[PDB]
Design a protein around this ligand. Structure first.
Ligand code: A69
Lengths: 99, 99
């Protein structure tokens, strides 16, 4: 699809058995999801945004479907106010910016 | 142009007559530039991101040329970690997400 930017580019994602709304975020290197109790091993990480850093749990090779397109990769889980789909998955679903 | 996302979508902008590098950021509602001087009146504002809130200076109706495309709009200036072109100006230059 084509998504204009008059409003936040929120889409439905499917991850770890849940449907969520997530922001397609070209400014995010990584994918950062709101707190969710995913199974499996993880590694601690700190990621920085406007306002400072938050602590997240890094889960690898997690399947995630974004607006009907399958992806698989690293997802960071922590106290973000918004689910953020970053470039690591945007590239996998063939997403580009166009103007 | 069409911009893919395997690298950060950084572009050159021209603002107050100066060249800068900025990130095309669909996750950003507003445009936020690193500390700099701009002409004219500004008002204090606060904005929030992944790591909390920051204080910025709101400049209205500021011309910026983004990768060769003209915009004139609100520019926030403050301790953002990176220069960010947000949706308020991405819409002005006709930027969409496509996959
Ligand atoms: O930060 C904003 N928006 C962010 C997403 C958001 C939206 C709503 C609520 C919370 C967050 C960004 O789109 C993603 N972040 C990095 C991008 C900027 C930037 C880039 C680099 C450093 C600092 C800021 S970010 O969320 O901080 C982010 C995302 C993924 C990621 N992976 C590794 S570091 C990292 C940082 C934002 C911008 C303007 C106004 C505003 O009110 C909020």
């Amino acid at each position: 699809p084509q998504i204009t930017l008059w409003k936040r580019p929120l889409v439905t994602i499917r991850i770890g058995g849940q449907l969520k709304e997530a922001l397609l975020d070209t400014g995010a290197d990584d994918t950062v999801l709101e707190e969710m109790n995913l199974p499996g091993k993880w590694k601690p990480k700190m990621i920085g945004g406007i306002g400072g850093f938050i602590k997240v749990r890094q889960y690898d090779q997690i399947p995630i479907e974004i607006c009907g397109h399958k992806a698989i990769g690293t997802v960071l889980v922590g106290p973000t106010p918004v689910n953020i789909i970053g470039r690591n998955l945007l590239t996998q679903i063939g997403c580009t910016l166009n103007f």
